[model samples]
Target chain A: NAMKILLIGASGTLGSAVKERLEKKAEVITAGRHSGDVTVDITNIDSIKKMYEQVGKVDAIVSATGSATFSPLTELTPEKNAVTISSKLGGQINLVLLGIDSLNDKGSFTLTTGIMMEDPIVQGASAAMANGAVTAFAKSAAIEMPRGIRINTVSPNVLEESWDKLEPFFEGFLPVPAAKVARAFEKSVFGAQTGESYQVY
Target chain B: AMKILLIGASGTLGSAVKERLEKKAEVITAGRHSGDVTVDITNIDSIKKMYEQVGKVDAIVSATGSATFSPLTELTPEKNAVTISSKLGGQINLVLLGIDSLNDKGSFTLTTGIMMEDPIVQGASAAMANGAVTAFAKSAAIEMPRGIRINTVSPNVLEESWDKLEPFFEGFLPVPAAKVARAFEKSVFGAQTGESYQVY
Candidate 1:
């Protein structure tokens, strides 16, 4: 049977690329904060519950959405760091927390992490912090998963479209095209791996 | 040649770090209630105030933090916050707050442990923190501007704490805290960046 896939951050830069790749075979239901087949605030548990309830049950949940503060570490206070926690770290994990029940047996979950976890950019601690948390959570959670549910993450370098604003930080480093990065998400969705971090650099 | 601020200076691990680190550099102790300086990591303002008081330093080493341990099934956002806020968030917060305050080319050493890599009963929250700190240390090392370096110490069960922490380890060998403290000294003064010195 063709899988029913939910793609979060569907309308954004990388999300759209993933949305394009997934729609070829799976019945893709795109959700976003701004525009998509549905709307969701992954930061809120209530919003995640509503998304799954609205989608009924899906075979997979892929999130390419998250935002974080990119200020200098000095400027990055506990107050500034909350956005990364609520949006990137907690947001994506919550998708899995509520999504586990809404997913069909053997359903897989793919979340986003980034090169920041490995490359650390100036003032990128906020995002880097969340990326690390999300990646580790996926790894540890993989061991205790029930119902054969699988979890994986994609750690991508800066995207082409994002290069305009991100280029300063990622300068001298080659940017990975969104299309290329999207394939990792595709693999996690259709592949059999668990607790893996597919790096698209 | 180096001046270091050792956070959590009074804890078992922190004490080991202070004793060993003091042998090489001037070790300035800081903790929530004790030490040469007092700072509560859970509060951002407290960190800022502490940094302001300390002025500038050559490096920062954090051996202090508290985390909640809960069975995975019993974990909730509220419960997970126990570790997320104090262990993960607080440690990272220390780095960000001190980024500009520290001398250029200075280093940061934070604490993590083996529980994340080696799971134990009711270890989910602590493991989560350990994993997050490990990840942040790895990634944060690459992007720290001004040549500042970052790394973490992932120690195995400590021999001194074995009697109390045995349930979590059961059969695992206990490493002396002194062995673990050496890793912090390396992180602070050594040339390596983006490293996690694991002592087993």
Candidate 2:
């Protein structure tokens, strides 16, 4: 009855909820860049490797962190966009690629994405790109995972907690509670689905 | 009557696009080494040099990209970077850097593939890049300056590469490159924007 779950970015709003939900059933090991049971800078491949090495083996890995530039499209230069490309896109991917060996047989991976990918927002193109990349990567990698390892992604809509701060950027869109969003990860980790994008919109 | 900058001109789909577009416009072919002009899509400076050399154009068409095909277990971050550099960063940078080189009402057409929607084994890297480009086009289309438009063409595996790629694409229908090339032509000539023309 004791399944170990590695939860990255475990300090954020969404991550906190996910951690609360996951802890109810499993032994949750929380991680973040600054504070947690362990630390990790997801953008660095070696950091991810070290984190996995330190954590030993786990039954599930859920990533709830990723950031992107919010500059206007005209002002979003290649350098500015690199933040999203490196962090949200490359960071999350490296997590899975580097953590494969650290996962138990039939283990699972659940990545975080957002609704901006489908419902576009002003200054959100970079975030959209990263979300789309993760979604597709999960879909394709699910078919080739070793030892029945399952992969899936969760795309949450704008959160009710962040609505006041983000309302202008996401005008006319509905906001879902982060608590509800965490349930999708709960499903991905415990359910039998693979290659699926759970949309908690 | 028009001038178009066509990258990856020597490839199968690029050549067909060159052939179709050449009927009505002056197509300036650009490739890594072999074409009317040589430019590497993965390098920003190289993309800049190509634009400076070619001057402004009516459209920019990119059919260039590369990615590694390996099992998920063996795919390293380093190996996956090739896909990110060439396919994802290369094509998007082509659009980001070429905006100024495009005249008013000019358009940009980039290539994606069916694998992003229809997943295949050993295709995670390529599929990731395709999804990135597709979404970028959709969002960028709404914000393009002047009358400039953006669209992507998603082609199924090509019949030309089927013999060599059959094992990887097993049982998937491979459409002729010529048919896929038509979507590029449509993006260039049609008024539609933010569209993903699936030539499956």
Candidate 3:
């Protein structure tokens, strides 16, 4: 097999960088809600299943996207917090749960986490919660994965490419380039490490 | 007012915490079925009603949340929901919804477990919830309003429940419930914020 990879959220700035980096050696099957070689909305369980069915069994599953709401603790309601839970926390985990059988033997699944979980920020609790959930899930799941399947998560700091729009939310924090963070994802896909969170800070 | 609201007051760890916390402040116990007041932590409206019924308090302590134990190969999204809705969502909601119910300079102390940091077999879902609650407490601590604070108590397996839980945790020493309660005591009365008191 000449490395067939399914890269979800493959149209964003970070996702684009990941696609560019992955395409140098492997055949990348880009998938998104509206853009990519195939369309898939990860929040919908059926959509993820449909995507695996369409892409067949691939060598790697890389997710570069998840949505979270940033709101002050006082104003963050249960209903609003559910957005982060379903998409980022529950959504990404489901990606692994539903896509495990669709992966080739010894194939890997990489999830996206963020630095906010390690370093606190105002209005970053929801996002932090999801990141922490996925990180621990990956580590624990790594020990129990059937066959030779592997799982890891990538925790990237604020991206330099989105600095202008995201500067206010991440004050005083240094942002990393998308190209640099993409290599961490590349490492997870190509490297032999499992149950590790590659922190590209 | 030196008052505290303790959810899950009837359980093993909760009873120990309530017994220890009552020496300094008034402890108002709440549980799903048996307590001074009833609260199903999994339900949002139930939490709202529990707070409304309890009125104002100086601190809120949660020793509750549920998670399923299964190997990763057999675990599903539906199985993971047990932990998501209870341990993760329930405990976090206590802070989100109970904030206004606390007086100025009040505090929130949540529960995490050793599994989040130290993984065990059939413990991934529980680890996920524990990690989320731990991180949420740390991040929310920095942004808490009106001089309030928040922290988490991460206890190792309990000696009290060792008979049944012994198989899940091998080659691990168990800590007494009284020892773990002191961590909750620190969060309730101490000045620290964004700390995880590991009673291991």
Candidate 4:
């Protein structure tokens, strides 16, 4: 049977590349806050729940849309930092929290994290905090997930497509292309690995 | 002048430990709800501000306690999962957050429970959460400030007050909370990092 796949943030740079790769074999349902087959706001629980209701069921849900306002650690107030936690960290948690009910048995959920968890740079504390939390959650959830459900996080370095724009942000680091990251998603969705990070540097 | 900050000094365990350490060093007290200094383990700002008030502490000791208790399936809500986030995860962040405030060669001491190494009913989540937190602290300590040290105090059930917690931890041996606390002081005074003092 063809898998029913939901790719959130399907219109974004990374999401688009993943969609192109997976849509050929699976029934791809693209969703984003704006400009997709279905409008979904990952930050909103009702929106995520409603989106799942609209789609009925899915074998896999992949999220590549997590936004964090970049700033130095000292300049970050709770309000500014909340943008990252609420959107990226909290939103991803909500997805898996709700995905438990929306996904079929043996289904897989893949979340996007970043290199900041391991390699911290100036003005990247927010990403570091969020990524670490997600990694910890994935590890703990892997052992406790009911049925055969699986969860994993992908931590990738700066992408080559956005190198020109993000180069200054990440000095002295290698950039990996979005295509290489697609392979990591494939491993998570199709392989037996769980609670693991597939890094593309 | 060496700086010192002690968090969670009003509780049964924290208060008793504070009494033991107070005679030796100037102890700045902070607790969850009431104390000379007010701090919330869940809020980063509260922790940062507390550090700012202390103004560059040489050593810090936290005997604060927290965890989620229930059978595995019972923890359905994020609220119930607060222990993993606030206690274990938040404590990890606290140490990371403390890096900015700590002077070079300073040390940090965090608290953990025996649940990570020992199994008890309703302790699965706590064990899972604390185990990850301890591993993170160890790994981060190795790479943190060159001379700064970080270690966690993992204690078995205190035998001194086993009567109070007897139901929750039936088969566990009770180690004195004071003995457990001495390990924390040892971490602060000693020059070792990336280690956990397990008092069984």
Runs of candidate 1 with Cα error greater than 4 angstroms are: A161-166, B1-3, B100-105, B115-124, B138-148
What residue pairs are clashing in model 2? none
| Range of the 10 consecutive residues with the lowest summed lDDT in candidate 1 chain A | A70-79
Q: Which ten residues in a row have the lowest lDDT in candidate 2 chain B?
A: B35-44
Q: List model 2 lDDT by residue over A1-201, tens digit each.
A: 479999998999999999999999999999999989999998898899999989999999999997888888888888888889889999999999999898899999999988878878779888888998999999999998998899999999999999999899888998999999999999999999999999999
Candidate 4 deviates by what RMSD? 4.9
Interface RMSD of each: 2.5, 0.8, 0.8, 5.4
Q: Candidate 3, residue B150: CA error in Å?
A: 0.5
Tens digits of per-residue lDDT for model 3, A72-165: 9889898888889889899899888888898899999999999999987999999999999999989888988877999999999999999999
Query: Model 3 shows how many backbone clashes?
Result: 0
lDDT of 4 by residue, B1-200 (tens): 56567888876668767876776777788777887788887887877887777677677777774776765444544643576457655675567567777788988788777776555666645664555456555545645554888888888888767888899787777888788878877887788886778998
State how far residue A168 of model 2 sits from its true place (Å): 1.4
Residues B1-200 of candidate 3 have per-residue lDDT tens digits of: 49999998899999999989999999999999989999998899999999999999999999988998888877888898888899999999999999999898999999999998789999999999988998898899988888899999999999999998999998999999999999999999999999989998
- CAPRI accuracy category, model 2: medium
Clashing pairs in 4: B3-B58, B159-B174, B159-B175
TM-score of each: 0.89, 0.98, 0.98, 0.75
RMSD (Cα, Å) for all candidates, in order, is 2.7, 1.0, 1.0, 4.9
Clash counts for all predictions: 3, 0, 0, 3
In order of the candidates, what TM-score does chain B achieve? 0.97, 0.98, 0.98, 0.91
Model 3, C-alpha of B196: deviation from truth (Å): 1.4
TM-score for candidate 4:
0.75
